[PDB]
């Protein structure tokens, strides 16, 4: 179950403070998506048990043709590169947000997060 954990790698963030541009700066460096900079990318707050529990009824519906919808809304922070280009420094523009998420899951654990619904 190494997807779910570069899931956590890529898009889970327990406890932030800011949630700024200094903070999507750092937290990309720290998570390895700098190498070339990741246009967009999205971390989920809060406690993992409820991201687990979007695999499960207790806090998901099914979604498109493979995917799974959160119930419930999460403080999330959307990371988006700002500039012409695609390596480092990476700059980017943070927005900060609280809504339900989409994942594909795998074995009850979720293995990828759905960016497109931060795209905006």
């Known amino acids: 179950n190494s997807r779910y954990t570069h899931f956590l790698t890529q ?19 720290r998570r390895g998506l700098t190498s070339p900079c ?3 990318n ?3 707050h809060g406690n993992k048990r409820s991201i687990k529990a979007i695999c499960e009824n207790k806090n998901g519906n099914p ?8 119930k419930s ?4 922070t959307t990371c988006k590169l700002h500039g ?10 943070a ?10 899951c795998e074995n ?8 497109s619904i931060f795209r905006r």
């Open 11 to 29: 898009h889970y963030d327990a406890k932030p403070q800011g949630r700024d541009d200094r903070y999507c700066e750092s937290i990309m460096r």
């Open 38 to 40: 990741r246009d967009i």
């Open 42 to 44: 999205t971390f989920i």
């Open 63 to 70: 979604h498109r043709e493979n995917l799974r919808i959160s």
């Open 73 to 76: 809304s999460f403080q999330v």
């Open 84 to 93: 012409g280009s695609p390596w480092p420094p990476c700059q980017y523009r």
């Open 95 to 104: 927005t900060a947000g609280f809504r339900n998420v989409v994942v594909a």
């Open 108 to 115: 009850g654990l979720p293995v990828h997060l759905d960016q």
